[PDB]
Design a protein around this nucleic acid. Structure first.
Lengths: 184, 48, 97, 233, 245, 143, 136, 184, 48, 246, 198
RNA sequence: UAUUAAAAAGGUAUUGUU
């Protein structure tokens, strides 16, 4: 018995049941720390992201317009699926629709036949970058396969949690300093 | 806790017991019982 | 039948692990069989006896035999229990039945 | 002290159905979805960025309309959009006549450098990590063509390029005397190690060479004839 | 070998009735190693540790039942409560395995049209666990699984609290989940007592550290004798003494 | 009961004929066997035969994920350095004039941060061992 | 020839359960105890009267994963949420107060009444939300 | 004799070696030039190429260009190794995804620590701890924050180093980058 | 612990202590669902 | 089986003309991608299975094309009924699921990411090519009333004519055995239960004299059997009546 | 989801609100005290070093006069507890017990909130700290001194008192580990014995 | 012994590379 996603033997989740944050946080609740608890509110039932492929082999990429604009006189929409050198992004990497792959191989290697795409290269690269989805810069697409990105984000937000903690502990240090400096 | 081997003697003196009975009383809250903890601090020969 | 298999606790250290098979049975209905591996004769015997009392089996003896040919396959040995007028099987298998 | 009863003309402002509305409007504006749990400084920065910068046909009509829901979800440009986004040579080199096109040919065990001119005039021969030494009777083949030797040899190539190319400019008739750099197009046959630092060596010399365009030409094998057998197959 | 004494009538019952609180008497025997004539021994501590962790099986089970069984009927209803009581009762007393008993639990008969009654009460199917854990604490306090009652509830509660922190804190790979052939180290067991004892060691060895394997203040069960002992002196000698009253 | 049922007082418990004809397997599974780890061909952490396996193939890039020793950027002192093109090009090795205070300020957070990320990956192995690892019992798929 | 490290003692991944199914122990203890030379465990005295459920076959034999084998381990308001976070949590902030009628609920009921009175989808959305905001 | 330019002896260099065609502006590589990048004014070409090389490295394009160009392998072995890589990548994607699906749980724990700080220290206090600029009523100090955050948001050119290419004795592979021996 | 003396003692004590009859709510105290004395509420009331 | 192309095993429970699933020249199984929905890449897809588990829902009935009336033909039913889960607009069990060896046989090339005989015979195109060009100033065939033949079974009570009575998402009446020579009664016994379903919708369950004489005997033939704990007596309205027993 | 009524981008320069909330108190205080935060009422009280409860109760019975006597003290405690974590005291605890008890069986279907409250009720018993100690002992968060203090507390017992405080069956575990209980629950070292002085 | 915050590897030998 293995799951499909990566082969897990369980059901990936964070919290199942309606209580499991309350039951975890009971004594706080009976002394009344959980009346105002926003830590029991934002994350009472936070479940993990759609960490999967909604359409894995890429049947829904590209968009229907892109087909009709995928012809031979269309290096502009060709070059938004080829590498900066003209290479196709391999099917494991950029999973394309089979019709897209067919139209694209023939469209590139016909544009290259009549010499209306460079026999090697990617002439529309930076123009094409606007369509190609800049992802690992600021926004965190939780369904990425780069783990360097996820670790930047886990750090940066752990950086900020530690930053709250730092600011307030040094303010408490300042308070105990002001104690002897103001009363004695 | 008294010393029962010459090791505990090294961490031991009544004048040090003073700083600790003071911990006792400064943490204590009522005088009816600061009464009994001061009774013990004076009854054990704590160097006041 | 006892046996002896060499056990290699290390490349340099080898032990003689005697390997027993035994069947603890009573024709009153209940009989299990245990095989064990243990370094000594009596310790392998005890280990197999406890494995047998784990593998204990019983039988609805109301029919005093199989009423239909049971064609099973144990760990490589194609077995067929069938109805006869009387126990007609090996010396060993017959004493098991 | 601050007595409670005194501040009243504000405490009926609430139970007046005029402030009920002016605060329930806020509560409704707030019930919506929000994607910021705490004060993000880059979200604040994004807000202030634009803050700085700025300083009916119902369903029936579109039901008969054909191309509507196609233009609704269309990702192509809508409205008058550019031509620098269609023309062939948009993100392409706009060369000049008077430019040196310097090749960096960095092979596996040797990395040489050449230059030519826009007409294909070789300005000097192929200065090599073997031709200037660096290769024969040395520490080994493992460093036959690493970064150090390649940098050394391209530095030696510029050593001659500067007098040579200024000589050619005087020879043709551009009295380019001083302060004007050499317009260089760096064509890099690469992926090896003799190019990684050779690039630094050409970069040390931007104080004489304005490199205009920077391109790599490592041919790729799509379907070409055999390459000499290795050891296994 | 963990061979329980085969009981008898009067005599084994004398030895067995005059037992008293074994967990305590183990603790007594562990601490008494603090007296002058004895040393605190890991063997005493470990006899304490096992005399306290005796009910590991029933506890890990009932925790699995409460917290890994989406929609367990109405456990507070005496039907499923009796399934629970009889199963956990035979999980202790060794008559059942953890795995088979959990299957007996999740398979016992509850109510006809079960999915249909459920999809009326539960959106995603997984009900509230308070009825479950109250049922399990009731289970182990009705069955005298513990001599000191609050212990049942405490372990039942704390193991759950501790697991509540894990990722996928309520899925268990059916193999490792309960007993089988191959298991996980007890630090990595699921509702176990060592899972919080999770740590590791840290070693700076001498230039000569493997040689001196006896030189330190080491407890010797098997004392060295001059036939194996090269120059070793004993665990009490101190060549480099410091002056002190 | 009082002990786990996959071991006997002599080793692993033999189940099938393979175990009974070759009982080395019950008491020997690599240069890091220990009587507690018997049969379990993942044994402890750091010792030999300890790697968790994800569906057959074993795992040895556990830090190389977090970014410790794989793609070390950490950027916290890195952006600081890359900024200080003065104290990057100076005798690059002082508490130089001003910016090496900020360099150590960034690195003071680098230290705590990487201790937190390392403990994350430690808990990651100790989780993935529970709920993903087959313990090498399933066949390879990386070939 | 490199085989999986721990392979030798792997479990038979399809028939490793079946030893443990409760029905096996029912079948196997029923005869052990019918013999009359055995004292049935206390769990048999019970799960004899309450035998396990019949059709909870394991996925390892019913080679069908989409099959909800076990009845126990079984498993619009999206927009009524994305338009008001106070509408969601109005009984469910710390632990779903599962016995009080909920505002999300009564707004679903209101929604359907409205859409059957003939107001379009988008407009029933607004009118539901405005009626909730009002009653707040 | 006549070698393709990806062969070892592509641009031979000796008395008798001859390179065909002109080499200025329009070169022989007019349609065979993969990656041109127009230099911005003064920008460092030690940055343009230290980015080009990292891209064409992560895209394992230099892997292939070195690989297929040296020894024309047996199609069997080329398939063997390429399939091996698609498969091993498909394996490590399982692992990356278990890691990601874990680190998002860790990050949810970071953010829930954030919301314990927020529900013991107050949300606006927390914002100040993050730097909510209350004491700065001056648009000038706001501009200072503006400028520092924008000089930081326009992240300076990051120089990603491309692991060196190794030459073992008989060059068993020129995909070699570290001294691991691979399956040949 | 005990190989069954305490077992059978608890069991005889149980079966002699089981209450039978209808209660004030309409169920034998071991009806499937209709619980009595929940959290000792009956002795609570009888104290109070 | 340890031969490759024999791992598919013995599948008698397919539909194919063989039991040896490795001899079926028809649907070579993609092995790396399938299985997300069917267990393993061997077993047939859940839209082609010929044998159904217990708690697993069997196939959905392909409704008429427009699928506006599949909810209007439960207008007889409780007003608020939702879409039926056992109904479908586009349930086709000859839908070939995509295989990588069948349609993208990469065998005869380097497997370099661009090569492969991608066969576009199987997947419904995503191009705007189609819906753009195959748009017509006329109407659709559903208006043109092009289609003869309606529904293959003629007059089905859920799709063509209104469904009266109850839905049967099990098969508790479909797997019913005739206890009568005229089949006016049908039976369905478990082990300790017996379900006696009057099957007589053409006359609105109005029992004839003979049928009531047979029913008086099948009712007590079941309520006298020894393994009868309960006798669920009811009407098997096949979607043709709302009557229990006229 | 961002909870209801909880504002995210709320600053301090953002004007102060009016609702008596824990969040409101905490942010207003962030403006007021600058940086003082107490982990409970008693961190503030250890800071004030000798100001008892009544010493602020009288202050506030004066400061706002329409308050009654104990109600002044209540405002005291409540502002503490609201800028802190609520306190663990036998006062609040007997309040909870007496009150829930006069409240009685509830109307949640399965006596649900009653069971929540009772799972709370025994969570703050000695037996819970007894067993918490036993559990921590099974984990070795202690040292030689702890072992010795346990031993000596056992020694101070007698036959009669053992026989007695065994009938509760947790009493004697607390009699022994009593110092360890106060340790494992008490985040403090009473012991820093400075220097021996002879 | 194939640079993880020490971690993954084979035998035609069956005390087994003399």
């Amino acid at each position: 018995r293995e799951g499909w996603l990566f082969g897990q033997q369980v059901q990936l989740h964070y919290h199942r049941f309606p209580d499991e944050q309350l039951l975890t946080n009971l004594t706080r609740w009976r002394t009344g720390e959980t009346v105002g608890d926003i830590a029991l509110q934002q994350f009472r039932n936070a479940q993990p992201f759609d960490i999967e492929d909604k359409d894995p082999q890429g049947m829904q990429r590209p968009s229907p317009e892109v087909y009709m604009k995928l012809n031979y006189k269309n290096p502009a929409t060709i070059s938004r699926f080829l590498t900066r050198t003209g290479h196709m992004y391999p099917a494991d990497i950029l999973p394309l629709n089979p019709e897209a792959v067919a139209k694209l191989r023939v469209a590139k290697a016909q544009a290259v036949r009549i010499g209306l795409y460079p026999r090697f290269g990617n002439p529309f690269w930076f123009r094409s970058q606007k369509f190609r989805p800049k992802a690992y810069q600021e926004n965190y697409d939780p369904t990425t396969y780069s783990t360097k990105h996820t670790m930047e984000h886990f750090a940066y937000n752990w950086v900020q949690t530690d930053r709250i903690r730092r600011y307030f502990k040094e303010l408490e240090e300042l308070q105990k300093n002001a104690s002897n400096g103001a009363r004695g | 806790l008294e010393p029962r081997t010459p090791r505990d003697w090294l961490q031991f003196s009544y004048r040090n017991l003073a700083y600790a009975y003071n911990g006792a009383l400064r943490a204590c809250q009522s005088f009816p019982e600061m009464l009994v903890c001061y009774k013990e601090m004076k009854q054990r020969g704590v160097k006041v | 039948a006892y046996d002896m298999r060499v056990v290699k606790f290390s490349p340099k250290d080898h032990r003689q692990w005697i390997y027993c098979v035994l069947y603890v049975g009573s024709g009153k209905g209940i009989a299990g069989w245990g095989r064990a591996v243990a370094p000594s004769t009596q310790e392998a015997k005890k280990e197999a006896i406890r494995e047998a009392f784990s593998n204990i089996i019983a039988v609805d003896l109301e029919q005093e035999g199989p009423m239909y040919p049971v064609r099973v396959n144990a760990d490589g040995v194609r077995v067929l229990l069938y109805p006869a007028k009387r126990i007609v099987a090996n010396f060993r298998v017959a004493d098991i039945l | 002290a601050q007595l409670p009863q005194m501040d009243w003309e504000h405490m009926s402002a609430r139970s007046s159905s005029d402030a009920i509305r002016e605060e329930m409007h806020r509560l409704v504006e707030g019930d919506a979805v929000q994607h910021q749990r705490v004060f993000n400084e880059r979200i604040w920065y994004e807000e202030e960025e634009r803050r700085r910068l700025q300083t009916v046909l119902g369903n029936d009509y579109f039901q008969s309309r054909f191309g509507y829901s196609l233009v609704k979800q269309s990702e192509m440009p809508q409205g008058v959009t550019d031509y620098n986004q269609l023309d062939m040579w948009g993100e392409m080199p706009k060369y000049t006549r008077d430019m040196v096109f310097l090749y960096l040919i960095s092979r596996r065990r040797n990395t040489y450098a050449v230059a030519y001119t826009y007409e294909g005039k070789r300005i000097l021969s192929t200065y090599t990590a073997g031709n200037r030494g660096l290769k024969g009777g040395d520490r080994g083949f493992r460093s036959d063509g690493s970064t150090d030797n390649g940098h050394q040899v391209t530095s030696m190539y510029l050593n001659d390029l500067l007098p040579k190319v200024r000589e050619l400019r005087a020879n043709e008739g551009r009295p380019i005397g001083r302060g004007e750099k050499i317009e260089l197009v760096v064509r890099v046959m690469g992926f090896y190690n003799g190019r990684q630092g050779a690039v630094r060596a050409v970069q040390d010399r931007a104080n004489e060479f304005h490199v205009r365009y920077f391109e790599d030409i490592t041919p790729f094998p799509l379907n070409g004839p055999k390459m000499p057998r290795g050891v296994f197959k | 070998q963990m061979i329980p004494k085969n009981l008898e009538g009067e005599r084994s019952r004398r030895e067995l009735m005059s037992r008293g609180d074994t967990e305590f008497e183990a603790l007594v025997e562990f601490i008494q190693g603090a007296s002058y004539d004895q040393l605190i021994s890991g063997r005493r501590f470990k006899k304490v540790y096992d005399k306290l962790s005796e009910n590991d099986d029933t506890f890990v089970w009932l925790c699995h039942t409460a917290m890994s069984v989406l929609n367990p009927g109405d456990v507070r209803s005496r039907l499923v409560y009796n399934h629970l009581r009889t199963l956990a009762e035979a999980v202790a007393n060794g008559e059942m395995t953890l795995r088979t008993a959990f299957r007996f639990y999740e398979s016992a008969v509850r109510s006809p049209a079960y999915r249909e009654i459920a999809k009326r009460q539960m959106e995603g199917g997984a009900a509230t666990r308070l009825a479950g854990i109250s049922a399990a604490a009731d289970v182990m306090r009705r069955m005298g699984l513990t001599r000191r009652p609050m212990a049942s509830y405490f372990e039942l509660y704390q193991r759950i609290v501790e697991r509540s922190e894990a990722m996928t804190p309520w899925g268990f790979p059916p193999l490792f989940q309960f007993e089988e052939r191959l298991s996980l180290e007890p630090r990595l067991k699921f509702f176990s007592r060592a899972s919080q004892q999770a740590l590791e060691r840290r070693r700076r060895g001498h230039i000569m550290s493997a040689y001196t394997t006896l030189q330190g203040r080491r407890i010797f069960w098997i004392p060295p004798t001059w036939n194996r002992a090269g120059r070793f002196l004993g665990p009490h000698v101190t060549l480099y003494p410091g002056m002190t009253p | 009961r009082q002990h786990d049922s996959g071991v006997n007082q002599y080793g692993l418990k033999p189940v099938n004929a393979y175990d009974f004809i070759n009982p080395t397997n019950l008491v020997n599974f690599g240069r890091g066997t220990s009587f507690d780890n018997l049969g379990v061909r993942r044994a402890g952490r750091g010792e030999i035969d300890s790697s968790p396996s994800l569906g057959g193939s074993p795992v040895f890039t556990q830090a190389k994920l977090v970014g410790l020793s794989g793609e070390e950027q950490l950027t916290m002192c890195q952006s600081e350095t890359m900024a200080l093109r003065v104290c990057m090009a100076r005798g690059g090795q002082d508490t130089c004039e001003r910016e090496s205070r900020a360099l150590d300020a960034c690195l003071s957070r680098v230290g705590h941060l990487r201790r937190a990320m390392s403990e994350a990956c430690g808990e990651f192995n100790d989780w993935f061992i529970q709920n993903v690892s087959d313990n090498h019992t399933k066949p390879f798929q990386h070939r | 020839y490199k085989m999986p490290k721990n392979m030798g003692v792997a479990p038979r991944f399809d028939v490793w359960n079946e030893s443990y199914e409760p029905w096996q122990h029912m079948k196997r203890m029923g005869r052990l105890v019918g013999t009359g030379f055995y004292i049935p465990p206390e769990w048999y005295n019970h799960f004899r009267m309450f035998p396990p459920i019949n059709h909870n076959f394991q996925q390892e034999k019913t080679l069908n994963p989409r099959n909800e084998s076990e009845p126990t381990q079984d498993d619009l308001r999206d927009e009524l949420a994305r338009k008001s976070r106070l509408l969601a949590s109005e009984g469910m902030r710390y632990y779903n107060i599962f016995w009080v009628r909920k505002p999300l609920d009564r707004m679903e009921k209101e929604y359907y009444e409205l859409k059957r009175k003939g107001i379009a989808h988008s407009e029933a959305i607004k009118k539901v939300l405005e009626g909730f905001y009002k009653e707040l | 004799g006549g070698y393709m330019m990806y062969h070892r002896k592509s641009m031979g260099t000796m008395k008798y070696s001859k390179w065909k065609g002109a080499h200025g502006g329009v070169s022989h590589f007019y349609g065979r030039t993969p990656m041109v990048e127009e230099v911005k004014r003064n920008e460092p070409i030690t940055l343009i190429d230290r980015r080009i090389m990292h891209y064409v490295h992560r895209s394992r394009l230099r892997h292939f260009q070195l690989f297929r160009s040296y020894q024309q392998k047996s199609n069997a072995t080329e398939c063997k190794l390429r399939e091996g890589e698609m498969l091993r990548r498909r394996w490590h994607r399982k692992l990356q995804k278990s890691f990601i699906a874990f680190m998002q749980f860790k990050t949810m724990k970071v953010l829930e620590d954030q919301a314990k700080l927020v529900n013991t220290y107050g949300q606006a206090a927390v914002n100040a701890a993050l730097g909510d600029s209350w004491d700065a009523v001056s648009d000038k100090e706001k501009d200072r924050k503006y400028v520092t955050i924008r000089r930081q948001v326009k992240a300076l050119p990051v120089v990603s180093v491309v692991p060196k290419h190794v030459a073992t004795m008989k060059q068993i592979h020129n995909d070699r980058f570290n001294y691991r021996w691979r399956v040949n | 612990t005990t190989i069954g003396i305490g077992e059978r003692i608890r069991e005889i004590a149980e079966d002699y202590a089981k209450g039978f009859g209808l209660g004030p709510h309409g169920h034998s105290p071991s009806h499937d669902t209709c619980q009595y004395n929940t959290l000792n509420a009956e002795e609570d009331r009888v104290r109070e | 089986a340890n031969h490759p192309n024999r791992q598919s095993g013995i599948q008698f429970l397919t539909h194919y003309n063989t039991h040896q699933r490795f001899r079926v020249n028809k649907d070579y199984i993609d092995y790396m991608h399938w299985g997300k929905e069917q267990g393993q890449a061997r077993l047939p897809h859940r839209h082609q299975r010929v044998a159904f588990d217990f708690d697993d829902q069997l196939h959905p009935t392909r409704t008429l094309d427009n699928e506006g009336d599949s909810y209007a033909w439960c207008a007889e039913q409780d007003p608020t009924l939702g879409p039926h889960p056992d109904l479908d607009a586009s349930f086709d069990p000859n839908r070939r699921v995509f295989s990588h060896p069948e349609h993208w046989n990469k065998m005869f090339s380097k497997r370099r990411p661009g090569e492969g005989r991608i066969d576009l015979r199987v997947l419904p195109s995503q191009s705007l090519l189609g819906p753009l060009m195959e748009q017509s100033d006329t109407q659709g065939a559903a208006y043109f009333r092009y289609d003869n033949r309606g529904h293959s079974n003629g007059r089905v009570p859920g799709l063509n004519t209104p469904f009266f009575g109850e839905f049967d998402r099990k098969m508790m009446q479909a797997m019913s055995r005739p206890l009568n020579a005229d089949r006016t009664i049908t039976g369905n016994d478990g082990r300790f239960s017996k379900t006696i379903m009057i099957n007589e919708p053409k006359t609105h369950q109005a029992l004839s004299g003979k049928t009531a004489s047979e029913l008086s005997v099948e009712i007590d033939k079941a309520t006298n059997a020894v393994h009868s704990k309960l006798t669920v007596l009811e009407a098997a309205q096949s979607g043709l009546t709302n009557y229990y027993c006229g | 989801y961002v909870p209801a009524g909880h504002n995210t981008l709320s600053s301090l320069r953002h004007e102060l609100r009016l609702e008596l909330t824990a969040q409101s108190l905490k942010e207003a205080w962030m403006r007021i005290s600058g940086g003082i935060y107490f982990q409970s009422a008693d961190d503030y009280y250890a800071s004030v070093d000798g100001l008892d409860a009544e010493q602020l109760g009288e202050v506030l019975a004066a400061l706002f006069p329409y308050l009654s006597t104990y109600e002044a003290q209540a405002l005291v405690q409540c502002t503490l507890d609201s800028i802190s974590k609520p306190m663990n005291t036998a006062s609040r605890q007997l309040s909870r017990t007496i009150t829930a008890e006069a409240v009685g069986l509830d109307n949640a279907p399965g006596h649900y909130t009653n069971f929540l409250d009772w799972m709370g009720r025994l969570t703050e018993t000695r037996g819970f700290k007894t067993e918490h100690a036993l559990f921590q002992f099974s984990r070795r968060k202690f040292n030689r001194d702890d072992v010795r203090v346990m031993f000596e507390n056992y020694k101070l017992m007698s036959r009669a008192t053992l026989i007695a405080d065994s009938a509760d069956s947790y009493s004697h575990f607390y009699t022994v580990l009593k110092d360890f209980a106060r340790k494992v629950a008490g985040e403090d070292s009473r012991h820093q014995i400075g220097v021996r002085i002879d």
